[PDB]
């Protein structure tokens, strides 16, 4: 499955964790809060996100929602000589 690294890391940590992320990232990008073009919420939302980022809120939310998720030989491998 080709998906975003964030969802990938989250899933690869969840039980039964029978999935694994392979290789590096195919590119670099980011999630943004959207607003209708010409919206009155455009500027306040931008400043809110800058404030949240500069205050460590986004890092804490990410850490809380992602990181906190977290012999003897048998007859099967010697059956050849018995056959």
């Amino acid at each position: 499955y080709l998906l975003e690294s964030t969802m990938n890391e989250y899933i690869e940590q969840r039980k039964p964790c029978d999935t694994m992320k392979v290789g590096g990232n195919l590119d670099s990008k980011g999630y943004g809060i959207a607003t209708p073009k010409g919206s009155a919420l455009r500027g306040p939302v931008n400043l809110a996100v800058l404030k949240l980022s500069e205050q460590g809120v986004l890092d804490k939310l990410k850490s809380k929602w992602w990181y906190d998720k977290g012999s003897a030989l048998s007859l099967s491998n010697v059956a050849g000589v018995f056959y």
Binding site: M7, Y10, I11, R14, W65, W66, K69
Partner: peptide, 19 residues
Amino acid sequence: TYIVTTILEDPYVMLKKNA
């Protein structure tokens, strides 16, 4: 009050156990 449109996607938006 206006609507913040969203989507269901773990771990961004989840319905609480016994929603």
